[PDB]
Design a protein around this ligand. Sequence first.
Ligand SMILES: NC(=O)C1=CN([C@@H]2O[C@H](COP(=O)(O)OP(=O)(O)OC[C@H]3O[C@@H](n4cnc5c(N)ncnc54)[C@H](OP(=O)(O)O)[C@@H]3O)[C@@H](O)[C@H]2O)C=CC1
Ligand SMILES: NC(=O)C1=CN([C@@H]2O[C@H](COP(=O)(O)OP(=O)(O)OC[C@H]3O[C@@H](n4cnc5c(N)ncnc54)[C@H](OP(=O)(O)O)[C@@H]3O)[C@@H](O)[C@H]2O)C=CC1
Lengths: 1190, 48
Amino acid sequence: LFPATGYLSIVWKTLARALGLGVEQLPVVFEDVVLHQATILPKTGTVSLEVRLLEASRAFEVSENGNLVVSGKVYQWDDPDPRLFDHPESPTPNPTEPLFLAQAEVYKELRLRGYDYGPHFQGILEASLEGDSGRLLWKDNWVSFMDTMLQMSILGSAKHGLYLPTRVTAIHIDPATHRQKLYTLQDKAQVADVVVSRWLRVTVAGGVHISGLHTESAPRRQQEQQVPILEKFCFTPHTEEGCLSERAALQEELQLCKGLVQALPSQQELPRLLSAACRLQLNGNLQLELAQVLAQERPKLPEDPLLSGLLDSPALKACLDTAVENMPSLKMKVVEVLAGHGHLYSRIPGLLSPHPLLQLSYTATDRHPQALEAAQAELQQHDVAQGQWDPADPAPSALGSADLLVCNCAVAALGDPASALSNMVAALREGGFLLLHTLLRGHPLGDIVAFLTSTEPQYGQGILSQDAWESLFSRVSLRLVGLKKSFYGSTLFLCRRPTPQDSPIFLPVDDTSFRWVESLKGILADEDSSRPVWLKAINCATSGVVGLVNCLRREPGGNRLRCVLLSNLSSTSHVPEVDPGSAELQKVLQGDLVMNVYRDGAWGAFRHFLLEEDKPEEPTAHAFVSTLTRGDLSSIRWVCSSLRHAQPTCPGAQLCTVYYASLNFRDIMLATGKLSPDAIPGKWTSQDSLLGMEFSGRDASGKRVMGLVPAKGLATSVLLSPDFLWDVPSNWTLEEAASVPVVYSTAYYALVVRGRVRPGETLLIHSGSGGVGQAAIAIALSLGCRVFTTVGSAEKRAYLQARFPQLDSTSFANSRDTSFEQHVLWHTGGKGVDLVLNSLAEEKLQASVRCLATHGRFLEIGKFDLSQNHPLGMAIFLKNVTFHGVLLDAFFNESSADWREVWALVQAGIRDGVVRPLKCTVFHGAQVEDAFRYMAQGKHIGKVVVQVLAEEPEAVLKGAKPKLMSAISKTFCPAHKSYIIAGGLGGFGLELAQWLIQRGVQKLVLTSRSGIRTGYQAKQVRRWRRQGVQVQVSTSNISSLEGARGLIAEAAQLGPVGGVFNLAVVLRDGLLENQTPEFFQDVCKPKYSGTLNLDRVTREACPELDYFVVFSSVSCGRGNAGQSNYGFANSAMERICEKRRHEGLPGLAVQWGAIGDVSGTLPQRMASCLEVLDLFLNQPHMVLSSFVLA
Amino acid sequence: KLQASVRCLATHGRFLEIGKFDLSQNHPLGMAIFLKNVTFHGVLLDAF
Ligand SMILES: NC(=O)C1=CN([C@@H]2O[C@H](COP(=O)(O)OP(=O)(O)OC[C@H]3O[C@@H](n4cnc5c(N)ncnc54)[C@H](OP(=O)(O)O)[C@@H]3O)[C@@H](O)[C@H]2O)C=CC1
Ligand SMILES: NC(=O)C1=CN([C@@H]2O[C@H](COP(=O)(O)OP(=O)(O)OC[C@H]3O[C@@H](n4cnc5c(N)ncnc54)[C@H](OP(=O)(O)O)[C@@H]3O)[C@@H](O)[C@H]2O)C=CC1
């Protein structure tokens, strides 16, 4: 975006040229600068900005493509006053804080906010913590300097979000005093001192003086935001059976197929084929007639759920990951046989996308060129190649040796099992894999397919018994590493070509001293030897050997690494013996898999799976409507509410159940995104919903009440001060009462309190149909005034006429047009109207002002003109006119003593009968989006209310609890509980702490060996303490068990322990040869030992704990080079977390690819990281991962 | 100087104008001030 200071600079240069002076010779003054729009500089091309000056009026105007962009007033400064640039009195006389933000931290904070400034705009050398005074650079560029001024001004604002300048009351520039003020540091760099005075709304530095700067929140909505890949790190046995048993549709399909088979109906292709086969004849069915039939000639059998059920199940992903893992290289070569019918080419490439560094060379082969001729576009979109090899014959040299083979024999027909397997194993490289999908004979579905397809013997041959397949594998000297089996007899074979037998090394890796590193370091050094090196740990289930091998394999010589781990999550589970003579070790050796993990009577390895896309939901009593995507009504959905944790004792609390909640224009503007949430007065969390202003429901005591709330009133419960509650009259209905509060309260405040309306006066009430208009009309007629009202349409006119008989046909006008001015002036004899209640647009507003009579009073309740700061000719005040700015939002913040006046007025109106409920259209809670759309259309008359809960016949109900309801899950914390973040003063720790506080923690303990030693840390800590949070700094190591106990105890003082997070990390990078046992001890001490100490102490004395999060890294699992110790520590942490959950205790381990704001994966922005952390916290899996693919 | 006076106002403030120069000249007045609850009064004893 083009900086506003850029506009100022170009205007200044234009004025200097017009006067003939040079820029540095011309002290200029700006006034009433206004930025109507922001210009976006394109990457390629140029944008022309045109500046026109009106010398007579001292006005300028910048335009682009004939569109106004900037306007204001500019003129030469006749008599510069050096007194002007003297630094103002400091708002805080004595900060007395040696700490101060440096350049890096300043722009780190600004990046967190959303500002991304490059080197040329990084002009702030330092800034005081409060952000009031600092030092700026002077690179001889004016635009950079003034933009740095604006940056300094923005740095102090507590409000979050992205704010940009919109108006500047006045700017003074004096190059001479600027040159005088500049002074040099020790370096040759030139600097100037800046001072910001929020009290006087003035920013002064060098020879510049900005006053009255006004910044307006930007939407801050960027398209094409990063989309992280979410996965769950789950254990996976090598062999499984009944994989798809959970699915019902598959079972129903099986029932249908067997039913047709019985005695020799659905949309699925296979049941349709069976029905066709049985249709022609009940007995003696022709093989030809059943083989061919319309709606079956297509290769839609694979599309049948039964046949391709396993492929859709994760088993395919597990097998593919297993194949990829045991690759000496980082590149994979895969070939598909009979691809025309297999169609795996359309599926396999998609599954391997998550791997960041993997490079794939896929090639599809078929018996005949015409087969697979179709879908050539599908092949083209992927990196695949055509093929002609027919498996029966020996493989062509072109394919040669490939890492992996995929067959999909279940649908494709194989000429002969033995011959095809021989050809394949010939094609398969040494140590490669053969993925084979087939249907097992002797199973119900197997027998059913055997009865069918008898016409083609080749397919019949493909169907074989499980033991037959196993025997076939042995004959071709192929070893079955793993097997996946469906519940209906389908299966998925994964076989590996044996590698030349070699004597394997054995190295215990369970020593706590890490001295085994030297032993391993020596062995790997002997790169000449090709003997595989088998690391095996059996002493501890928490050994993180998995991460170690994952990292080591990348480093040179890592090809020889192979792991064997025994981790049982149940003590009762026995431990197999891994002695060389023991059978199990020999079996795993024959398999020759990199990862061999045994857990509770099963051999397997950890795998990555994409987790469910759906957002978790739970049944809750407290939930509030929210828009998950700002500006989209389609996203409106219910979310869990923080009200679950609340104190009923407090008299100010007065928690109330919600039955009907109304919608107002403000709610639509918020949902539509036309109104920024920050525009709502008050201190609001960044993540929250500000929908709904009024409601009506039963109090905690059951008494029916209607209430008014600043926001969050559209929910199943509201926390409200009793001052904002009225008792519903016995004759009203809770639905009716849902409309009275806001409209009547604002009408009374506008007329009686401010306008001081007297009986017999004259009024002009715009938008009579609207709720506020109806309330105002009802109030006025009671006094006995004469009313003029404007209505958009004829039906609204008729409705108002019916509702208010006293009102007359001459009391109407047209609102959408500006013709009412003539009508009012004519029917009033030209005198005008005493009182005006205006809520219309700029031109309508100007028209209304002319309607005022002498001693008139203008009541303004709109916002558009006020926000835009449109001018108002003051000549109207020559009469005794009084202009009122009426905002009801002020009461919710202060002046409650004043608010009681309006409360009494509304109560008196209610009891006297003046107050009448408006017409209501009811939408059920589940249809809230429909209500929003209907009100957005603008055809509604009266109010739109959402029936959150139906009213009971009883007048007063003892238990007013809301009915349980299902909504999206969110994370909130009780106020009384205490939370601990180990190493919370790091880059991630502080951001996580802030995120938690926004969830209402109120009691925090941050651990760090060094303690507060940076300006940013001190700034954040003091900011939090100002909000009332009880922050604490420990400096107690979690590595030492005594240290962990002390940390927990001191945390308990603030209150019961709620959650503990382990973000402590010390890293010592370097290749294995460089690593030494000391570095491993140092790296694992805060992460491995600390986690064990925290687990022990928490399980000992933290009964109320519910959150136990341990931050791991993607390097573990995925693998990375030169970070073996890091991977080991992370893997150990993950193992501890996995064990904890098995016992019912809470525990979580998160793997982050990279953090940007504070291995082929781009750094992830902090906002996305926190969102994903919330989602993870709400999920039940033991370990989760997140990263952004390059 | 009139513009300077407007800025000094606080929320719920009231502005009482008794000078008749700017009013007669019909000089502009930014309406953004009214966002803060504010009542701009045009005082003229002459009416009585
Ligand atoms: N103290 C304060 O600052 C407060 C201010 N207010 C203001 O009161 C005003 C009136 O609110 P209220 O009458 O309850 O609003 P409603 O939406 O209930 O009524 C809107 C009225 O104005 C017109 N209108 C407004 N918005 C739309 C729209 N999106 N689509 C179609 N027609 C629309 C309608 O047509 P038509 O007019 O043509 O018949 C209708 O008469 C608002 O401007 C609000 O900001 C309210 C309370 C507090
Ligand atoms: N890209 C990333 O940053 C990624 C982060 N992670 C993990 O996420 C977490 C957050 O990392 P992040 O905060 O960015 O990194 P930091 O390096 O900033 O975290 C280390 C912090 O912990 C403190 N600390 C060190 N030892 C201890 C100890 N024994 N007890 C208490 N505090 C201690 C350090 O202070 P001091 O040195 O003075 O003790 C420092 O403040 C870490 O667990 C990290 O491993 C993993 C994946 C990606």
